[PDB]
Ligand binder design. Structure first.
Ligand code: FES
Ligand code: FES
Ligand code: FES
Ligand code: FES
Ligand code: CL
Ligand code: CL
Ligand code: CL
Ligand code: CL
Ligand code: MG
Ligand code: MG
Ligand code: MG
Ligand code: MG
Ligand code: MG
Ligand code: MG
Lengths: 907, 907
């Protein structure tokens, strides 16, 4: 051990450390500076950036031996605090740079380092700095972060007053549609919002820390578990196995379709008889620290009989493949789509037909914060779980029978969280922590490392797809045929539903009167399927939007004009036979047209012999809602202090549940003149917030936004004075009148799609958009650079523009990843950010352009649709269409790795 | 466990706690708010004061169940931080209210609570508030704390500008003699100085926490130790016993006098054969936390044969008493005092003689911070100990042979510390932590609780005393006889030396030509003797100063005039035959006289039938230095940045080692124009600071102050340019000239007192003072209230007036405790602050008056003497003399408990 006397955030610290210890651990654990965020732990994400003697370093890869006596360290806590914000922190707030907020401390500390060395950077200088310092963000698409740096620099340079970093209320006093900052932004930019791992450090002494004993083969029969050596190891309390589970030890898919051949109870909580994928949790070590639990977990011995594993859909779907879940065929679900007339004769007599085989793979979510959860037994006898769940009520019912609790005896709460992008539509760690809390009676905390986040959370499910179009010479679509195979890994939850998305979204955007198709879901031993932003659209619309370009090529027609000819107009129906609710695609195409033509001309002029430029188009469509007559609930409560609490379970991945609530309520409460800072939101909790439903399906703004609107309308009625005006809280309480008022809303016009035909009216509100990608391909290396993305977006009406702009930039960046670099195919190689192709700042163009073409929705609150998933519906199709434009090469199977592109160029 | 969402220092905290947990533990351990200081842990000291929903509460006695959802908590960290100080914190700094600083956060938080309820308090309102809230201070005497509250309130009230709370540099630029604030004050008032227990919380995961297995009888032969149950208990690593000690397992007294009958190696590190006092450490449990170590320590079984214990000096000194240390008589040392002619004939022929038997007991130090230390093996192979040692070099040599290390292999460092008042002139926990670090190879931390601080640290040693005077009718002293018996408990360290103090200080202040006396030291089984501020003078001068009043009474002379007649004047010698170095007592008496006469008149006028007022006088004298030719060393270093570091081992109990260094160096460096903020001090460290010696004997200002002066003079010579002016660092470095320059100083004129006669010249500088106490006795109850204290003090020249004023107020308050309420006699009853008679604010008058009558010392730096122990030399004699003045009752045996006073009143 060594004494080190240093200065941290301006205060002399008399430190006692192990010279081998990581600075991140010292700062977080010994000094309580949990504003230093840790994600990857491998020096790849910059979340743990700190200033050390004037240099920006990653604290997770800086040992204490590199910190000299007398060193100066700055963390986010030293940059500024609430009520003493630095210009960078004010700028972040103003520009909406904190979505999940997990990367915000590291970017801000890194930026301070930049500005201390270059007071007046160009935008390009800012991008070069964040690239060099590995500052990664999965939410924002980087552009808002650069905007914030530039604004702060101008203030620091005396070129503009600091007061201009503070939001100015619009003239009308309306925050709906404005850039009003989100309530959680100050806490995020100051490092004072506690995420799950931060909460773990601030839990009491009694708390047990868990480590997973995980399968290191993809498929096996389990013969036994020997814990004897682990029990003798430092700090070890106990080891938990399936024997300690008090219920069924299975997670239920809950809404398993009746035509599914499996019962939906296939997923274990702790493996008993079998390993179904690499990483499966077989046991939990409980110890005094994460480090001691992990060390002991390595000594637990599992006796296994390894079985042949099926690592892709086609492999597992073979007619003679062995049943992974004995008694259920590996192909466990099929969804037909049967619209209009038989397609065979129409294809035979059509002027033109095209066909393609496409593949979209196992995209990894890659939030900067790896999964984390904790649980405890309350003094009320109930089991409490605090996790990254974005469907607290959903998950309660998915896990309660398995853990052995009635629903009233379990409470699920959503912690502040550093992004999910859908992986938390699935249970991950909730049942594990519940089982351990119940078995030990003690508080328990489980943190995944980044390898476990990659290997042992669910993934976008690969789809192998064949799609065909028949059309007239003038471009009018006549018919479509479709076939898709969905590799869902071993656990069925929502796999059938994902497969149904193919019937709804393959070919969406166009009038197609005649469709015949079939989706099939298959169990495999690769990673189980969890929702990933877009949930079947990124697969479906990659195929159809690439195929539209192929059809345009075969017709000798411009691909934007082919889309114009076919885009939904009054009278048309979507693939499930439903009329669209608004008709904005022609408007969006007309507004994009001159920009597209100019981009074509620029690409022609600026192309060189070695660097070929191209422009690509696609349409995107997705529903806002869960299928059928989805619903939500909110309570609007006038508090004694005159503030209003809007109680919901709107789960915040980081997308903006806080600002969605405040902005929607503010608009609904305007008759009573309620200031936005007086409106409070509630963190999701199954005991004390209503069942607003999950934050999946780009649904909350529509469903919970409407419920909030109705609750607030009902509160206004409750407060109305006869003669005009409004009663105060004290007046209502004196009259023994209610102050907490419910609102509900249901998407009553919706129906579930039919099991035989696929037809129905699954959503009452959709999102619509048109993408344009501008790319350069180096034809010597095959490397593609995306130079610009544009999204024409119809969101109906914006609740908050900082929220929507950011959602779109984030989704476009994930689209660039999906197109060019991202997969989870190789269990080890793809288990790091860099290995799996995470997009760092230089991979995302600074030119991300949005054009809102909003057509107010009949059923949306104040006319709003959702936004969340719109920007990832088909940006990757636009990008691949642009590669084709540039070079003549079509990539059919994502991603467009350089070698793959080169092989196609040279064929 | 329960979730609690509350606000702490203005920030929302999502807390997870045990409802039974103490708020102090939650704030310190879970939230890292170590500005919440914990001392007593029993709700008696206020150090852990926090604001909870507008009320000031003691966090160590507030369970989390009393903290409601939505509660607001403020700690010192929420009051203000460095560079954002609250007016209370600025005022504390300006008024010198932080000495050790341990109580400062709690007083400041408590004061904020006061001012939030009463914006314009009277001084009396402030005293009532701190009494009610149990805010205890052992350093300051409370008056500076009240001054600070009043000044802050005026600013908060807009009656004066906040800038007036900031120190204004004197016209001359001289900080010597000024009220310049101490360098450590900002850290103390903000809770950002880490004391030993705070450092323990910020140590790494690997650190083992220790608990003592202690004797629960006063005297025994040990037969065995059974650790088997303790080893099976939660979190337990190992148990350490004498078998694990690698050296002699004895602490050496090091300077044991040759005429001592014992070898000075009597004290074990871990008991082997015997228990010698209640509390002796027999074993150490090493565990993952203090709580787990303590639980397991209760299960360690010690097999003992209890022996009859001698619990007082007279008991152990009986001719037939059994030897506690077999082979050494219990009375192990005698010091004669033989000055001038045989006293018997002079007593026989004298006009008047008086005699008395007096007792001063086992006063407990009662710092607000209980003992704490830690140790580790450095990467350099050396053992490091960080503790409350106020003699790091001394303790290194006292413990190295016992722990089994050569001196170069052990390093002792003084942590910031919350007061000692002498108990840390002894080793307490240093050898214990060293043994455990060496045995385990791991860092170890040991915190005593307040019961252990009381029972198992050393104490003022009781003295049973008989003193006699012979005098002429005119009051001229002719002769003195003296006999004293010193109960030193079982461990000999510095016991012989303490006994020698009796020869030096009984009767000090007066010319007494003929003295015959004898001091004897006896081992007992009550608590071992450690220095307590005054170190033999409080005993010695209680006897002589009470006896002077008895002599005045028998002569019918005023007691101030009897002192005037006899006080040292040129030609006189002190008891050891040495001429005083200055003669300030007549000056001080003349200046006090009218104040004394006025106080007598006020007491006559304001006395009632039931409440009798009195006035009492005493003189105090003590040396500044260790005996003989004491010495110190300092290094003055010009740093590259133009600052100057003055390297010393001046140990800071809280008295002001920092400001002593800065002020002394500033004065010495004035020719070169060095600003005070450019002068740095060093925390004591045996490897990297010179052997400046211990902070005992009121010696550092003289000895180390002189060494600092000489070092700085030598640095000026090193920096001098030919032609005039001074070279800069860069100029000296370019010329390959030295920048780190040594200075030494030795008290060359001093000699050790003789073993046969007691005569010698032990100190070259003394401190001199005259006390006046004003008291009221309730003759129905026997309760004495001290209404005023005055000290005329000759300190030569003041280094810093905030430091000296505070030292005097602190010592006067300890004098009130010693006189009226304090003892450690009953092992259990006296093991709490309240039980042992700690003086809370109402016990200390707001009227504490100082008058400096400074006569510059020939050998002091810039003429300075020490101050530390002067104010505790005899204030308790003045107080008892005042009780006599009021009521006619003399208390001979301290303390003057009410029942004792009543029995005397009614006799
Ligand atoms: S770079 Fe340190 S946590 Fe990712
Ligand atoms: S805001 Fe950057 S990772 Fe979420
Ligand atoms: S009153 Fe809480 S530590 Fe003393
Ligand atoms: S300053 Fe108050 S206890 Fe030391
Ligand atoms: Cl391909
Ligand atoms: Cl490649
Ligand atoms: Cl008495
Ligand atoms: Cl009493
Ligand atoms: Mg500022
Ligand atoms: Mg079954
Ligand atoms: Mg038509
Ligand atoms: Mg202020
Ligand atoms: Mg011996
Ligand atoms: Mg004389």
């Amino acid at each position: 051990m060594i004494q080190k006397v240093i200065t941290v955030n301006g205060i002399e610290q008399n430190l006692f450390v192990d010279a081998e210890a990581l600075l991140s651990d010292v700062l977080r654990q010994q000094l309580g500076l949990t504003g230093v965020k840790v994600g990857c732990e491998q020096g790849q994400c910059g979340a743990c950036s700190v200033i050390l003697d004037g240099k920006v370093v990653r604290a997770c890869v800086t040992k204490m031996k590199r910190v000299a006596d007398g060193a100066q360290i700055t963390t986010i806590e030293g940059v500024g605090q609430p009520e003493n914000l630095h210009p960078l922190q004010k700028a972040w707030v103003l520009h909406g740079g904190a979505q999940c907020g997990f990367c915000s401390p590291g970017f801000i500390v890194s930026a301070k380092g930049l500005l201390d060395t270059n007071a007046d950077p160009s935008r390009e200088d800012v991008r070069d700095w964040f690239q060099k310092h590995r500052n990664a963000c999965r939410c924002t698409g980087y552009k808002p972060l650069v905007d914030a740096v530039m604004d702060a620099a101008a203030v620091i340079n005396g070129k503009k007053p600091e007061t201009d970093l503070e939001f100015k209320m619009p003239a009308d006093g309306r925050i709906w549609g404005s850039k009003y900052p989100r309530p959680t932004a100050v806490a995020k930019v100051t490092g004072t919002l506690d995420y799950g791992a931060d909460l773990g450090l601030k839990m009491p002494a009694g708390t047990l820390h868990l480590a997973m004993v995980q399968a290191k083969v993809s498929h096996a029969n389990i013969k036994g578990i020997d814990t004897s050596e682990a029990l003798t190891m430092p700090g070890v309390h106990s080891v938990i196995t399936h024997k300690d589970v008090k219920g069924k030890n299975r997670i239920t898919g809950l809404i398993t379709f009746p035509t599914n051949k499996g019962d939906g109870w296939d997923r274990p909580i702790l493996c008993d008889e079998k390993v179904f994928q690499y990483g499966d949790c077989i046991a939990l070590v409980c110890a005094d620290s994460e480090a001691n639990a992990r060390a002991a977990a390595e000594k637990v011995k599992v006796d296994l009989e390894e079985l042949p594993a099926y690592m892709s859909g086609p492999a597992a779907a073979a007619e003679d493949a062995i049943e992974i879940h004995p008694g259920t065929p590996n192909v466990y679900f099929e969804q037909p789509i049967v619209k209009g007339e038989d397609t065979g004769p129409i294809f035979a007599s059509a002027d033109v037909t095209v066909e393609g085989d496409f593949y979209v793979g196992r995209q990894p979510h890659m939030p900067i914060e790896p999964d984390v959860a904790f649980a405890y037994m309350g003094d009320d006898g109930k089991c409490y779980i605090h996790s990254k769940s974005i469907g607290v009520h959903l998950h309660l019912y998915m896990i309660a029978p398995g853990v052995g609790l009635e629903p009233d005896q379990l409470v699920l709460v959503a912690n502040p969280m550093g992004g999910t992008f859908g992986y938390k539509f699935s249970p991950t760690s909730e049942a594990l922590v519940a089982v351990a809390a119940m078995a030990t009676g003690r508080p328990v905390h489980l943190r995944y490392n980044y390898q476990q986040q990659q290997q042992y959370t669910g993934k976008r499910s690969p789809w192998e797809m064949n799609v065909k179009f028949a059309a007239k010479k003038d471009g009018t679509l006549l018919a479509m045929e479709s076939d898709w195979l969905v590799d869902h890994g071993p656990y069925s939850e929502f796999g059938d539903l994902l497969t149904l998305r193919g019937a709804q979204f393959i070919g969406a955007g166009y009038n197609i009167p005649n469709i015949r198709g079939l989706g099939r879901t298959v169990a495999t031993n690769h990673v189980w399927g969890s929702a990933f932003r877009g949930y079947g659209a990124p697969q479906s619309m990659f195929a159809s939007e690439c195929l539209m370009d192929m059809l345009a090529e075969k017709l000798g027609m411009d691909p934007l004009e082919l889309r114009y000819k076919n885009a939904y107009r009054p009278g048309d129906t979507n693939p499930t036979g439903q009329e669209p609710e608004v008709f904005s695609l022609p408007d969006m195409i007309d507004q994009l047209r001159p920009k597209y033509q100019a981009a074509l001309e620029k690409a022609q002029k600026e192309s060189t012999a070695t660097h070929k430029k191209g422009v690509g188009i696609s349409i995107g469509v997705y529903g806002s809602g869960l299928d059928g007559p989805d619903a939500s609930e909110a309570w609007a409560e006038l508090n004694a202090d005159g503030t209003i609490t809007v109680h919901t379970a709107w789960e915040d991945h980081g997308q903006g549940a806080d600002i969605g609530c405040v902005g929607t309520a503010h608009e609904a409460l305007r008759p009573m003149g309620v200031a936005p800072e007086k409106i409070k939101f509630t963190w999701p909790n199954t005991a004390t917030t209503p069942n607003s439903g999950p934050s999946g399906g780009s649904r909350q703004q529509v469903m919970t936004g409407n419920a909030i609107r109705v609750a607030c309308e009902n509160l206004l009625k409750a407060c109305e004075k006869p003669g005009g005006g409004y009663y105060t809280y004290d007046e209502l309480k004196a009259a023994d009148k209610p102050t907490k008022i419910t609102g509900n809303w249901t998407a009553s016009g919706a129906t579930h799609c039919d099991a035989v035909t696929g037809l129905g009216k699954p959503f009452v509100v959709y999102m619509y958009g048109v993408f344009m990608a501008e790319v350069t391909v180096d034809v010597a290396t095959g490397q593609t650079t995306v130079d610009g993305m544009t999204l024409m977006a119809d969101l109906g009406s914006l609740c908050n523009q900082l929220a929507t702009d950011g959602q779109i930039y984030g989704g476009l960046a994930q689209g660039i990843g999906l197109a060019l670099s991202e997969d989870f195919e190789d269990i080890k190689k793809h288990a790091t950010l860099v290995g799996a192709g995470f997009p760092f700042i230089k991979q995302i163009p600074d030119k991300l352009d949005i054009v809102y073409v909003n057509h107010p929705r009949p059923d949306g609150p104040f006319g709003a649709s959702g936004v969340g998933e719109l920007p990832l519906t088909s940006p990757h199709a636009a990008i691949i269409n642009a590669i084709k434009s540039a070079t003549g090469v079509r990539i059919y199977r994502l991603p467009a790795y350089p070698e793959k592109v080169l092989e196609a160029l040279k064929a």
